[PDB]
Amino acid sequence: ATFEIVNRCSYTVWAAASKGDAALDAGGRQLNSGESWTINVEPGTNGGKIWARTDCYFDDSGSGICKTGDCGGLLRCKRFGRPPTTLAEFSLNQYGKDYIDISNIKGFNVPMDFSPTTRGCRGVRCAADIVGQCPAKLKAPGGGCNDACTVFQTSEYCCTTGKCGPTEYSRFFKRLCPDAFSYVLDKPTTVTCPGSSNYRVTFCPTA
């Protein structure tokens, strides 16, 4: 499956793509404002994620650091990135279907649209200004808006025991972006697409 990753933001981002234990495609690449990078993701990829990283520096061997979304200091991500990170999430060819969603469970750094480029389903979007409206105690000094699990490390926010409910913090994310996961047990906003669909992830989809 092809995922065209497009940077409409006015600033550079470093796209990242991983399934947690491995890179997807090259795993990461710089995208200046306006650039597009098309990756190929193996069919049957389960638990894939794509995200943006901001204010990164890499040296000649591709080691450095990112202020949001850092995946162990690599340009080419092999693991998931450090919160806060708005997340495009997908599992492909799962009994004949693709499943896609956007999640704020690991916080928010960059607005995002995640849409099929082929027929038979709709896209999802979290493009509100969550960074600018972020509650005081969630603001990440490094840039972006942390989820409450990251900040407070409680069973209620992290949903450790599997029994959590919505919270003042999760409700802020859900109000800004009704169509993204705001906590682990949020009512699903996952979209079912035909197996082997193709996709576009757009950073900063709106003005």
Swiss-Prot record:
Its main location: cytoplasm. Keywords: Cytoplasmic vesicle, Disulfide bond, Signal, Taste-modifying protein. InterPro entries: Osmotin/thaumatin-like_sf, Thaumatin, Thaumatin_CS. Disulfide bonds join 9-204, 56-66, 71-77, 121-193, 126-177, 134-145, 149-158, 159-164. Gene3D superfamilies: Thaumatin. Taste-modifying protein; intensely sweet-tasting. It is 100000 times sweeter than sucrose on a molar basis. GO terms for cellular component: cytoplasmic vesicle. It is found in: Cytoplasmic vesicle. This is Thaumatin I. SUPFAM superfamilies: Osmotin, thaumatin-like protein (SSF49870). PROSITE patterns: THAUMATIN_1, THAUMATIN_2. Belongs to the thaumatin family. Pfam families: Thaumatin.
